[PDB]
Design a protein around this ligand. Structure first.
Ligand SMILES: CN1CCC[C@@H](NCCc2nsc3ccccc23)c2ccccc21
Ligand SMILES: CN1CCC[C@@H](NCCc2nsc3ccccc23)c2ccccc21
Ligand SMILES: CC(=O)N[C@@H]1[C@@H](O)[C@H](O)[C@@H](CO)O[C@H]1O
Ligand SMILES: N[C@@H](Cc1c[nH]c2ccccc12)C(=O)O
Ligand SMILES: N[C@@H](Cc1c[nH]c2ccccc12)C(=O)O
Ligand SMILES: *[C@@H]1O[C@H](CO)[C@@H](O)[C@H](O)[C@H]1NC(C)=O
Ligand SMILES: *[C@@H]1O[C@H](CO)[C@@H](O)[C@H](O)[C@H]1NC(C)=O
Ligand SMILES: *[C@@H]1O[C@H](CO)[C@@H](O)[C@H](O)[C@H]1NC(C)=O
Ligand SMILES: *[C@@H]1O[C@H](CO)[C@@H](O)[C@H](O)[C@H]1NC(C)=O
Ligand SMILES: *[C@@H]1O[C@H](CO)[C@@H](O)[C@H](O)[C@H]1NC(C)=O
Ligand SMILES: [Ca+2]
Ligand SMILES: [Ca+2]
Ligand SMILES: [Ca+2]
Ligand SMILES: [Ca+2]
Ligand SMILES: [Ca+2]
Ligand SMILES: [Ca+2]
Ligand SMILES: [Ca+2]
Ligand SMILES: [Ca+2]
Lengths: 772, 769
């Protein structure tokens, strides 16, 4: 039963094996018009043949070594798969129909699942060397499946770890449509969604995809703008897409390869290097087998009776025919042909096959060496090596713990899986022969804490095979300090737009999603990067004008004092005696008060300065005018007292019913703030000005009626002149009072006060001073 | 050999069958201390037994029919699977080892794939009735698989269509870990991502899941705000999670069920209604098989000798034992016990099994009725019905075309697939008994273009089983008008925040991603939904201030006209002749011009007004001053002509123009005029002031002379008035910007003109009249 081509040997215990000597079957359309015939597989697999030789070498070495299973020999029964489920099921049917003790598993995950479904019925243990699908770790469906290779969850996590380490957020994914790529892509999608990474496209490929599908995938890749692509597939399934992309000449992409095709000879070609240069992928850990290469080099089509594949091996290696293609003898050298059969650098799957073979032998030895009364079966008994059975071997494999030739313990967990380290490689170009050379740049440690597993040597990486600069795989560029992030409808969060912050607000981050606002008494600078303090505007003594306006007030004070001194010294003189001396003294004191009252309008407006800035001039000028109207021909003193008392009443009631107070205003201009004080009540100020103007008008009329008189050196005309200039300077500033609101309101008030005081002093006293 | 429990009959052609008589197997895991034994099955499946009976009915009816396969008989060989791959693989090994022609497929997708992997080796056709996975459409790996049920791509598309129809963007997903749930969830994820729908979580379940996994899934469900959950699984896989959720009393969720568990009896139970009420799911199209209920109701443990499952059927129906718990006598009635065996409303998978049996039976008739020379094989030949083979039956099934018992046409496409309509159902509570009722609320057409496939009646839906209001699942409330969207870091694009638009911008529609700016003459209102026109400020005729100034101007003009009229009405008296008669006419004409020149400062400043605003007053006042300054006509003409030169040079070099100011306040437009060359205006001011100054000096040096009513005193008075009014204007010009600068100009002009006229002419006009 089974195919004609096989490798067979006899022994006390027989082992099974399945290896992919071919890459795939011949593609054709079978119309059911004639009886269907057997399908043939086409291309050859030197790597699979090397795996088969590794298994045979392990079995033969175990037989030769007398320290393991004495007085007992092992045989084998090995078939070919051509990487197809149908071919592997024919061989498996002959395994369960001599009986096999255990089978060394297949390569593909789907083939392994199909074989294990049949193998688990009879409880025949199956140890695989290359199937890493997470679906095979379910022990409810696969009762007797073990493997020497770890599952792909760690690799899928490592891919996301690498992507996060190189700071990318815009990637695409491609997977093969089988039991190996889909769960891996699902796990990677979960991890990437956890790590805040956006995925643009996701596609499925196959070895038997057609022209429309390949062109659609190529157009999707071409139209996409992401530059990093994660591929979870194998070489036979990835070849057509690579061929089409090479034909279309698409460059500038970054490939993240899984372990299946990170070292495949189908893709690593010099012709394709200009599209797949700089690939970063994963590799397992290499082992050491001493005499393996010597065992490999000794194959021969005539000296290998047990091996049936050696004939076609010779045919494919030497392009000949064994008794158009010529006739080749049996005298050639396999060390002069460039084939992957012996052109290897590390052994990984070969070491997996070695370990999978040795595990069964160790379990058999454990069965053989049992001491009665301390076994694992029923009431402490154990099996017998004369008629041992598959379920007993499976139990002992489930309870196995041994150390290998290198010195590491081998143990299978509850799910029958091992644990192992990963390595990271980079594709380069050989300067001598042009071949692709795999250069190690990092590793992945699975015994470390989360977030401490990845190590990357950045300086040893060429990115497209010729570049030393890390690529750019962001959807959009980063925002600046003065801008914030926007929203583009119909796009993921990884893509946005930068919008400048509005006036009065600032931002200081390169990825800010909003604009900040530092607190009051502050404003945002011109480009809204930082917020600066506001400026306070007010006329103070420091203000240049303030110092000029103070120079003037003290000049007036000094002039009044000098006039008073000249008057008091010459009191008895008839010129002074003509006027009332006490009235002159009171008038000069009131002029002193008027010149002093202008010094309250300058400076910081404290709550008391603005309380008395106005009445200090109002009362003084009222007293001046009242004394002036008196000095014209003591009752007059009491009339003066009445005139001052009337103003005192309204001033006191105003200050006691609605005091004026300081005020900081931030409304006229946003960037600057003012300090100006309102009057509280406006009726009081209006009435003050009205009473002052009423007394002024009364004095003006009274001095107008008696204008034409020469008494007192024509005082009654200079009085009218003084009243006229007072009225003119009061009228001239009404628009300034009613319109502006800055520091110019204070300065004009001081100017008017000084003008009125100076005119009132000069017009009255200059004539008498110039003659005394 | 095969399992002892089976159903068997003999005929010319033997058919195969696989049905799930049991829900599963016992979870007793051996420790390999002793030799392993056969595993047993736990629960009974009346629906599976009915499915099994349908095939036997179809075969019996075919054998009874005399016009379909005369002189031929059909046998069968049916086994149990217990929904397990291992049990179904044991039966399949007996099929390929007295040779079957075709096998009626299994129920589960994984079991179907496992059976097809072995059945394709020998090219034995296999027609399934319930496996709808899209992985079975691959003809490069399944060379002999056909099905009477459509695949799940249409259902996955319809789920996203329903979600878009009910306007949701915040959902969760739950799937079974097998070949039925994962591809469906993948296709649904693709469709939902294409349709702009955000998915919160995604979890996997299984029939043999453990306590910690179930609690983790429950916590993941409970910690989210998404209310709509899409489930692609079956009842046996869903039961533990539903039981745990019922135990923890989680309510308020909306379930979207796939066709596998949308009618499962394991989930649709009264005790779980408070959790799974108001479920919306899919269903296939029902069929009609006459004489089928009568065939179903005739089962008996003794009369049915070919069937071997009848004894266990009886024991599970009546809960007793059979002699070969009480003892079953064997005379009870099936209609007196309520089990899903005969308590049904529609036949869908039973009709699928019937269709598969008849599809197998028609290819044999096609082989039998061929004509030599025109055949489906080499050289136009055909086979022999006495030695027909599986590959020939497969060919004739691949080239099959026949009419149903209703009248529709049955053909298998290049992938051995069918297409069919979908039905949409809702879960309710029956007030009569309390059972769950599946109420039809819509359908899903497949013979239509994209976008016109789904019909839903919303008025027939109860939400959570008791409500008539469409639920809410957003992750964010809608942003209103005048408000903008905002990014939340670390969250999907479906969750955002609302931010108000700034000053000067607006937004009208809802869910706006940006605020639009307003045109150059509009400004946003307080609510920032739309902007309004800016206000334009300038002195106007309608404004009362302008009307007052206009009234003053016309009064002055009329007074000047009256003065001139009285002057001309007394042309012979010597009082007028004492002064220059002709020069006074020029003086009064210049006075009229000066009065009239004050109407160019009122109104909206146009281009032509601002060009001749200033020169009119300048020329008029120079005329007046030069006339007062004094042969005499020559002197005044040459003195006043020099200003026309600078006026025309100004108006030819840099004419002033109107200007709209939008830089002082952002909500107010100030329309003023700029002079341009300030040097020309300064020169006009200087020339006028210098002429006034020389006139004032000449009149001041000779005040005392009473030549004619002391005219020198009045001339000096007028000059002083002019100089005083054109000094009082300085603060208003300096710090009263706006519409108040134009007013003080008019006031000063009118005051100066009135002072001049009153000083010069009134006294003489009072003496004359
Ligand atoms: C009491 N006071 C002090 C000296 C300046 C002047 N006060 C002018 C204030 C003012 N007038 S109108 C207006 C509109 C808004 C704001 C302020 C004003 C004055 C003149 C004569 C007599 C007393 C006084
Ligand atoms: C040409 N013009 C006609 C319009 C009115 C006025 N325009 C000048 C306004 C002005 N701006 S600053 C200044 C400083 C002192 C005086 C005025 C001004 C004016 C006045 C006197 C003579 C001629 C004219
Ligand atoms: C009624 C309701 O809330 N409808 C929501 C809406 O708020 C949300 O903006 C939109 C986004 O696609 O999805 C839907
Ligand atoms: N892990 C792959 C098989 C595989 C591993 N390494 C390989 C190298 C070459 C070819 C195939 C492989 C699978 O499960 O399908
Ligand atoms: N379609 C499901 C099987 C199925 C369909 N309808 C059902 C009803 C009950 C149980 C199972 C089913 C699958 O492929 O796995
Ligand atoms: C396996 O055996 C070695 C050698 O005795 C021992 O050191 C180790 O602890 C064992 N491991 C386990 C997991 O039992
Ligand atoms: C894996 O790598 C880490 C770090 O290099 C190392 O410490 C550890 O021993 C490795 N594990 C094995 C099994 O070699
Ligand atoms: C790409 O995006 C990541 C994640 O947001 C960010 O840290 C990184 O700076 C971006 N790259 C560049 C070049 O801006
Ligand atoms: C099947 O038969 C019908 C009825 O004769 C015919 O119209 C149709 O073209 C045939 N083929 C298909 C694929 O339906
Ligand atoms: C599906 O329904 C539509 C109407 O919704 C009908 O025209 C069509 O015939 C139906 N298809 C089948 C196969 O019954
Ligand atoms: Ca030995
Ligand atoms: Ca394989
Ligand atoms: Ca996150
Ligand atoms: Ca390879
Ligand atoms: Ca989109
Ligand atoms: Ca018949
Ligand atoms: Ca089944
Ligand atoms: Ca059911």
């Amino acid at each position: 039963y089974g195919p004609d081509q096989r490798a067979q040997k006899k022994g006390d215990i027989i082992l099974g094996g399945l290896f992919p000597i071919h890459f795939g079957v011949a593609a054709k359309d079978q119309d059911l018009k004639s009886r269907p015939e057997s399908v043939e597989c086409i291309r050859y697999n030197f790597r699979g043949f090397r795996w088969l030789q590794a298994m045979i070498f392990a079995i033969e070495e175990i037989n030769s070594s007398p320290a393991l299973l004495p007085n007992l020999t092992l045989g084998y029964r090995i078939f070919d798969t051509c990487n197809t489920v149908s071919k592997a099921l024919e061989a498996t049917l002959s395994f369960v129909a001599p009986s096999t003790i255990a089978v060394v598993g297949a390569t593909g995950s789907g083939v392994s699942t199909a074989v294990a479904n049949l193998l688990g019925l009879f409880y025949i243990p199956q140890v695989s060397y290359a199937s890493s699908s997470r679906l095979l770790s379910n022990k409810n469906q696969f009762k007797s499946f073990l493997r020497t290779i770890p599952n792909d969850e760690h690799q899928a996590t490592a891919m996301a770890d690498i992507i996060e380490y190189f700071r990318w957020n815009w990637v695409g994914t491609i997977a093969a449509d089988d039991d190996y790529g889909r769960p891996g892509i699902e796990k990677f999608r979960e991890e990437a969604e956890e790590r805040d990474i956006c995925i643009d496209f996701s596609e499925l490929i196959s070895q038997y995809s057609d022209e429309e599908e390949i062109q659609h995938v190529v157009e999707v890749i071409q139209n996409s703008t992401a530059k990093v692509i994660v591929v979870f597939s194998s070489g036979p399934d990835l070849e057509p897409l690579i061929k089409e992309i090479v034909r279309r000449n698409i460059t500038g992409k970054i490939w993240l390869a899984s372990e299946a095709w990170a070292s495949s000879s189908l893709i690593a070609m010099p012709q394709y290097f200009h599209v797949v240069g700089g690939t970063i992928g994963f590799a397992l850990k290499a082992g050491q087998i001493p005499g393996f290469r010597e065992f490999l080099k000794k194959v021969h089509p005539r000296k290998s009776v047990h091996n049936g594949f050696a004939k076609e091996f010779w045919e494919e290696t030497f392009n000949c025919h064994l008794q158009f293609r010529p006739l080749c003898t049996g005298d050639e050298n396999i060390s002069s042909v460039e084939t992957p059969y012996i052109d290897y650098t590390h052994l990984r799957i070969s070491y997996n096959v070695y370990l999978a073979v040795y595990s069964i032998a160790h379990a058999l030895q454990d069965i053989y060496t049992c001491l009665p009364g301390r076994g694992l079966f029923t009431n402490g008994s154990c099996a017998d090596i004369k008629k041992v059975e598959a379920w007993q071997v499976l139990k002992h494999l489930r309870h196995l713990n041994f150390t290998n030739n290198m010195g590491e313990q081998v143990t299978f967990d509850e799910c029958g899986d091992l644990v192992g380290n990963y390595s990271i490689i980079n594709w380069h170009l050989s300067p001598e022969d042009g071949s692709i050379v795999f250069k190690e740049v990092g590793y992945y440690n699975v015994y470390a804490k989360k977030g401490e597993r990845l190590f990357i040597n950045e300086e040893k990486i060429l990115w497209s095979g010729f570049s030393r600069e890390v690529p750019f795989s962001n959807c959009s560029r980063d925002c600046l300090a003065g801008t914030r992030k926007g929203i583009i409808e119909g796009e993921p969060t990884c893509c946005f737009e930068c919008v400048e912050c509005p006036d009065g607000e600032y931002s200081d981050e390169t990825d800010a999603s909003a604009c900040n606002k530092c607190p009051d008494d502050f404003w945002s600078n011109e480009n809204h990067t930082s917020c600066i303090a506001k400026e306070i505007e007010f006329l103070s003594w420091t203000e240049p004008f303030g110092i000029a306006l103070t120079l003037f007030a003290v000049l007036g004070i000094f002039l009044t004092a000098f006039v008073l001194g000249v008057f008091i010294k010459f009191r008895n003189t008839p010129i002074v005696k003509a006027t009332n001396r006490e009235l002159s003294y009171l008038l000069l004191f009131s002029l002193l008060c008027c010149f002093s009252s202008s010094l309250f309008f300058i400076g910081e407006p404290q709550d008391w300065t603005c309380r008395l800035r106005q009445p200090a001039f109002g009362i003084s000028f009222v007293l001046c005018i009242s004394c002036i109207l008196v000095k014209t021909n003591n009752l007059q003193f009491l009339l003066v007292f009445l005139c001052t008392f009337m103003q005192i009443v309204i001033c006191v009631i105003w200050l006691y019913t609605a005091p004026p107070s300081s005020y900081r205003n931030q409304e006229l201009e946003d960037e600057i703030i003012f300090i100006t004080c309102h009057e509280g009540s406006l009726m009081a100020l209006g009435f003050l000005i009205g009473y002052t103007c009423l007394l002024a008008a009364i004095c003006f009329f009274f001095a107008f009626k008696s204008r034409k008189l020469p008494e007192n050196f024509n005082e009654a005309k200079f009085i009218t002149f003084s009243m006229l200039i007072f009225f003119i300077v009061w009228i001239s500033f009404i628009p300034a009072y009613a319109s502006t609101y800055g520091k110019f309101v204070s300065a004009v008030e001081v100017i008017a006060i000084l003008a009125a005081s100076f005119g009132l002093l000069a017009c009255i006293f200059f004539n008498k001073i110039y003659i005394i």
